[PDB]
Amino acid sequence: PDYHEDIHTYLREMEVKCKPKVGYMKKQPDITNSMRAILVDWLVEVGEEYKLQNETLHLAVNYIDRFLSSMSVLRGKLQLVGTAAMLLASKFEEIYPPEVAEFVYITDDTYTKKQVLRMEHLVLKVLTFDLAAPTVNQFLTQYFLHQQPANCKVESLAMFLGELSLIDADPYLKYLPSVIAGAAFHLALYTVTGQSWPESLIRKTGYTLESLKPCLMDLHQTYLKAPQHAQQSIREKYKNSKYHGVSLLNPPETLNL
Amino acid sequence: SMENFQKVEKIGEGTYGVVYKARNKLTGEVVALKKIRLETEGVPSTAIREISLLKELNHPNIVKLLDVIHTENKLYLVFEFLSMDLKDFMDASLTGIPLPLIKSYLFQLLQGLAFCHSHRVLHRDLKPQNLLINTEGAIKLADFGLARAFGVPVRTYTHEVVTLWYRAPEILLGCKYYSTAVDIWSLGCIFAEMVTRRALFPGDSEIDQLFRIFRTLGTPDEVVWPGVTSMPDYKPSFPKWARQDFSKVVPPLDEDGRSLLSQMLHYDPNKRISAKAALAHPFFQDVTKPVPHLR
Numbered sequence: 066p067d068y069h070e071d072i073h074t075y076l077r078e079m080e081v082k083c084k085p086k087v088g089y090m091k092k093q094p095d096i097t098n099s100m101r102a103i104l105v106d107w108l109v110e111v112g113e114e115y116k117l118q119n120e121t122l123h124l125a126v127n128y129i130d131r132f133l134s135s136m137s138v139l140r141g142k143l144q145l146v147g148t149a150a151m152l153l154a155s156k157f158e159e160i161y162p163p164e165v166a167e168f169v170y171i172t173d174d175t176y177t178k179k180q181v182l183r184m185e186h187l188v189l190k191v192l193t194f195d196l197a198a199p200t201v202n203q204f205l206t207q208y209f210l211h212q213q214p215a216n217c218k219v220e221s222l223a224m225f226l227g228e229l230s231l232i233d234a235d236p237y238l239k240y241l242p243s244v245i246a247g248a249a250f251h252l253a254l255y256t257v258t259g260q261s262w263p264e265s266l267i268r269k270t271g272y273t274l275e276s277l278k279p280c281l282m283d284l285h286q287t288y289l290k291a292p293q294h295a296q297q298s299i300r301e302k303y304k305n306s307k308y309h310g311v312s313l314l315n316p317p318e319t320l321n322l
Numbered sequence: 323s324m325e326n327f328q329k330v331e332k333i334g335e336g337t338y339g340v341v342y343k344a345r346n347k348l349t350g351e352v353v354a355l356k357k358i359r360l361e362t363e364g365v366p367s368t369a370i371r372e373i374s375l376l377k378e379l380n381h382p383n384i385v386k387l388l389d390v391i392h393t394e395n396k397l398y399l400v401f402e403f404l405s406m407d408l409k410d411f412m413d414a415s416l417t418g419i420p421l422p423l424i425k426s427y428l429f430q431l432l433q434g435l436a437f438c439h440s441h442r443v444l445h446r447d448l449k450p451q452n453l454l455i456n457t458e459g460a461i462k463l464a465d466f467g468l469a470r471a472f473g474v475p476v477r478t479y480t481h482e483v484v485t486l487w488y489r490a491p492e493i494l495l496g497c498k499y500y501s502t503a504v505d506i507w508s509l510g511c512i513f514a515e516m517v518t519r520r521a522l523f524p525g526d527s528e529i530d531q532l533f534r535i536f537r538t539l540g541t542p543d544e545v546v547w548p549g550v551t552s553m554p555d556y557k558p559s560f561p562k563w564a565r566q567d568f569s570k571v572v573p574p575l576d577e578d579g580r581s582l583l584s585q586m587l588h589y590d591p592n593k594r595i596s597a598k599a600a601l602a603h604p605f606f607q608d609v610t611k612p613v614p615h616l617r
């Protein structure tokens with residue numbers, strides 16, 4: 066099908082260039098992984114409240130991680146960075162983005178409009194206006210085209226697992242979106258149908274199960290431990306019929322390979 | 323800041339903001355400035371989208387963005403300056419645009435467009451006013467204010483898209499999914515316009531636009547466009563116009579010209595020729611790069 070290969074190649078180029086710094090939190094004096102996890106889980110709620118696309122959620126997190134990779138931020142201002150990031154992602158991705166006033170509302174009177182608007186400009190300057198970032202979602206939708214045949218439970222679980230990876234910078238910040246998407250898809254497909262990463266995707270991506278194993282092992286642990294995780298907005302989201310209640314499914318205890 | 327730019331003259335508005343011709347006072351460079359006043363909703367999605375995409379796209383047939391400047395009440399985009407837009411050029415041309423120049427412009431536009439599509443960008447406002455030409459024979463896509471980064475496969479995007487005359491029938495009939503084909507349709511209309519010297523489908527409304535397209539290409543049915551009778555804004559009451567010979571639609575065009583245009587104006591988006599495939603159409607076998615000899 067036309068342009069699918071070119072687009073995939075190009076996205077594989079851009080994910081490297083849009084990659085945040087792997088160990089930036091160590092260099093952040095006042096913020097932690099846990100604090101970022103709180104922030105990301107909150108963005109999930111915002112996405113739910115305003116019925117935003119999952120893509121917007123992923124874009125925002127990329128903006129956040131890229132911003133935090135070069136700017137030190139105090140814990141009290143992290144949410145301002147987050148709010149501004151969600152606003153820009155919405156403007157980039159959404160047909161009908163929420164008004165700035167709505168973004169000031171869900172902060173709970175924490176920041177002012179002028180603060181949100183100034184933060185928008187700062188994020189833009191820091192990101193040098195480069196907002197078209199490849200996401201786990203963008204690879205997932207491509208990978209879904211290789212199902213035989215299409216299974217809606219598999220898709221939702223993949224989207225779910227891929228979303229869980231956004232929460233924890235350790236260890237997912239060291240994996241590319243194309244790789245997390247690979248691991249999410251295989252893990253999803255294995256849980257629902259008992260099938261594995263397909264030959265047709267080995268062909269397309271050049272990723273094998275052996276190559277995905279390191280990420281796939283991490284994602285399997287997160288999945289198993291998801292109900293005990295401090296952050297829970299993603300499990301609650303994917304409980305809904307909209308996502309076929311896939312977060313209620315039982316994860317496998319072994320993966321074989 | 324804009325200390326170093328001297329505004330020569332306002333040249334128009336397009337999609338969003340106001341475009342000026344200006345001069346860099348230190349280097350002499352002639353530039354185009356697109357000004358945005360910061361509706362206090364922050365930076366507009368149109369500016370956000372145009373800037374990140376134009377920064378991704380380096381190609382001889384896509385306009386070059388040189389710089390972005392914020393003077394905290396406005397936002398300026400700084401482009402290279404060429405000569406004029408294609409609409410300007412066609413209004414000035416009694417004379418006609420010679421075929422070798424039409425072929426060359428079409429060839430370049432398809433290259434610019436294939437580059438966009440290969441890089442997951444829909445332009446969504448291809449029209450003569452948004453195409454720019456210089457004295458040396460080049461033509462470039464400009465005004466990416468209505469553009470967007472699409473995914474594979476596409477989801478539902480903004481329905482507003484494309485200025486009426488250049489708007490693909492799948493948008494008009496309200497299909498929930500549209501993709502790259504809509505840019506091809508727009509280039510088809512422009513191709514015809516360059517040859518005929520008049521717009522192909524100058525509708526004043528959506529239904530007028532559909533009826534004008536039908537009277538040229540035939541009212542579509544399930545054989546020619548599987549699914550069409552089921553589209554949201556398809557009406558069984560549509561008059562049933564017969565399809566006409568392409569030799570009558572663009573009479574000056576020879577056999578390959580007609581073939582390419584009918585492939586660009588194909589009703590079914592999936593069967594409509596890609597910009598990448600169109601580059602190899604035999605129409606372009608003798609393609610050169612003449613100068614427009616404008617002023």
Ligand SMILES: O=C1N=C(NCc2cccs2)S/C1=C/c1ccc2ncccc2c1
Pocket residue numbers: 333334335336337341354356385401402403404405406407451452454464465
């Ligand atoms: O010309 C441009 N047009 C844009 N949007 C639509 C419009 C067309 C004409 C007026 S408004 S953005 C843009 C940038 C630009 C760059 C170089 C140019 N060189 C010559 C003439 C116009 C130019 C415009």
Ligand SMILES: [Mg+2]
Pocket residue numbers: 090091092093094095096097
């Ligand atoms: Mg730290």
